[PDB]
């Protein structure tokens, strides 16, 4: 039995907020413009460092601790790029035309062109970001969606623990929306709208995963062993 099922919505929100990873920085080299290798180097270096913080963020997501090591690994392997992406999109919300990879790494769409096949990814991310902006996504909602990604993305590549915890997070989302003053109709409508975004984030991840694989073959960017193993899990 898990301590996660007995949590209230308030206690669920508080745990998730307190679990949030820090906003890491990128290199302070002001040498512009970027080359393809240098930009890719920055993104993968940042991704490498964020993964470490993601790991203990995950272990603080209610219910995740009650999972076996193998099951924890499967979920992270499946969702890690989604989780990086929705974090990026969240940070980018107040920056309509740009992507806030880091506070010192704020990139526009045009800078995506410095890496081949990256501009298409920039566009999808920006579109997701504007979407989050128009919907007026709240921080408490964001962390709910991100943990959902963690628990859901790998659940079918394995009345069970994860689904019960997913139901919990759903209850939490509804509680937030009621607390924000939305009608019942508005509540489930907004719930639906948010979850459908996850479908797109999944799509972006698959594009990004393919793009990362190609740069690996291109040998442009030196990729960390951790990052390579995370990429190997998706097996193309």
């Amino acid at each position: 039995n898990s301590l996660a099922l007995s949590l209230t919505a308030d206690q669920m929100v508080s745990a998730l907020l307190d679990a949030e990873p820090p906003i890491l920085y990128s290199e302070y080299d002001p040498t512009r413009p970027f080359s393809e290798a240098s930009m890719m180097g920055l993104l993968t270096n940042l991704a490498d460092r964020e993964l470490v913080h993601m790991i203990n963020w995950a272990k603080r997501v209610p219910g995740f601790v009650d999972l076996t090591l193998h099951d924890q690994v499967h979920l992270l392997e499946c969702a890690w790029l989604e989780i990086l992406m929705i974090g990026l999109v969240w940070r980018s919300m107040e920056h309509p035309g740009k992507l806030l990879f880091a506070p010192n790494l704020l990139l526009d769409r045009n800078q995506g062109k410095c890496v081949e096949g990256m501009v298409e990814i920039f566009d999808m991310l920006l579109a997701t970001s504007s979407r989050f902006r128009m919907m007026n996504l709240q921080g408490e909602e964001f962390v709910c969606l991100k943990s959902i990604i963690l628990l859901n993305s790998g659940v079918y590549t394995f009345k069970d623990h994860i689904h019960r915890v997913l139901d919990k997070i759903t209850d939490t989302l509804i509680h937030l929306m009621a607390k924000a003053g939305l009608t019942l109709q508005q509540q489930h409508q907004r719930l639906a709208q948010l979850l459908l975004i996850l479908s797109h984030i999944r799509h972006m991840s698959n594009k990004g995963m393919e793009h990362l694989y190609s740069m690996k073959c291109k040998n442009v960017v030196p990729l960390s062993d951790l990052l390579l193993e995370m990429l190997d899990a998706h097996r193309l």
Binding site: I55, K59, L69, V73, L226, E229
Partner: peptide, 12 residues
């Protein structure tokens, strides 16, 4: 052997 294994056992 897996790096992800180490991170999870040693998480803070």
């Amino acid at each position: 052997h897996k790096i992800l294994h180490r991170l999870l056992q040693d998480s803070s």
